[PDB]
Amino acid sequence: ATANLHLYQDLQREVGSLKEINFMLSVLQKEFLHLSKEFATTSKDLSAVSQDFYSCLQGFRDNYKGFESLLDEYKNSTEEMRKLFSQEIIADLKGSVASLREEIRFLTPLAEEVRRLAHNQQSLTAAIEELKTIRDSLRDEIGQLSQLSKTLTSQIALQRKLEHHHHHH
């Protein structure tokens, strides 16, 4: 089994990446709020998908809180708490992080590409379809991450309460 210090270092790397992903998704969220309002009277379908990006990216930081919390538990940890450093779940997280980074890569140019097309009286049909496809992929990835994170939050919270309870004596 992988040493807990190495799993801590793996988690440190992935939580650092999650914080970058969170920041980049906050920028993209705001960009799609703008796009949604800009296009509300010009392209109802573009406006609706743009509002969907705004909505599905709400509270993204909360969707990895269990990982961030786990990382924060290592420094002065008990042996029991360190059982929550699961090599399978940290390896699974690495896949989520990579997939989210790639979704960002594909999404990054698309709002200003829509604006460019619209300013030139060009069709938005293909762009709208691409946006709906990325929205669906991103919802799937965020759901998978959120479930892993929420499980960890529950486990850490209970173990922390238990360890604090022992300080009655």
Residue numbers in the entry: 86 to 254
Question: What did the authors write?
Answer:
In this paper, we describe the molecular architecture of the prototypical bacterial SNARE-like protein IncA, which mediates the homotypic fusion of chlamydial inclusions. IncA is a protein of 273 amino acids composed of a short, cytoplasmic N-terminal moiety (residues 1–34), a bilobed transmembrane domain (residues 35–84), and a long cytoplasmic C-terminal domain that ends in a tail with low complexity (residues 247–273). We demonstrate that IncA folds into a stable, non-canonical four-helix bundle that is maintained as a monomer by intramolecular interactions. Cells infected with an IncA-deficient strain of C. trachomatis similarly displayed multiple inclusions at a high multiplicity of infection, further establishing that IncA is required for the homotypic fusion of inclusions.
